[PDB]
């Protein structure tokens, strides 16, 4: 429906990682990076459309973009797109290394053991990595 307080906090934390002087803006060239850190997988066309619909993007504009993407993208597609971003090398599995980088790029400071525990919770077939359906199982709850 709309973004929760905890989603807003998480989006602000990711945005702020590219707002180096704290002035509430990122550059238009940084928008894609911030979106990908949040599990969005925008095409070049999608990014340029969002940029044109508003050389900087301020946080209220960004948050409005994110609220619309969250509400209007099909839920199954949202999961597919997030898996595609997080699976950095596209081999069909999120490795522990890839997942550590995802959590770091959100702005979190998880230990390596905490990320291993994320993997173990999701890993149903025991291969130590997270495939697409294992991700769906986590992300549908």
């Amino acid at each position: 429906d709309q973004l929760t307080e905890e989603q807003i906090a998480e989006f602000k934390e990711a945005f702020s990682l590219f707002d180096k002087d704290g002035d509430g803006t990122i550059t238009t060239k940084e928008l894609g990076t911030v979106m990908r850190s949040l599990g969005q997988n925008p095409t070049e066309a999608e990014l340029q459309d969002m940029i044109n619909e508003v050389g900087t993007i301020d946080f209220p504009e960004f948050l409005t973009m994110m609220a619309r993407k969250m509400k209007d993208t099909d839920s199954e597609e949202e999961i597919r797109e997030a898996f595609r971003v997080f699976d950095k090398d596209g081999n069909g599995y999120i490795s522990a290394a890839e997942l550590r980088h995802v959590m770091t790029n959100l702005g979190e400071k998880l230990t390596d053991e905490e990320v291993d525990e994320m993997i173990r919770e999701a890993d149903i077939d025991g291969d130590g990595q997270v495939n697409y359906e294992e991700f769906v199982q986590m992300m549908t709850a």
Partner: peptide, 11 residues
């Protein structure tokens, strides 16, 4: 452990 990733999508 997965709450921050789950928040990235809707159900």
């Amino acid at each position: 452990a997965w709450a921050s990733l789950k928040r990235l999508v809707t159900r």
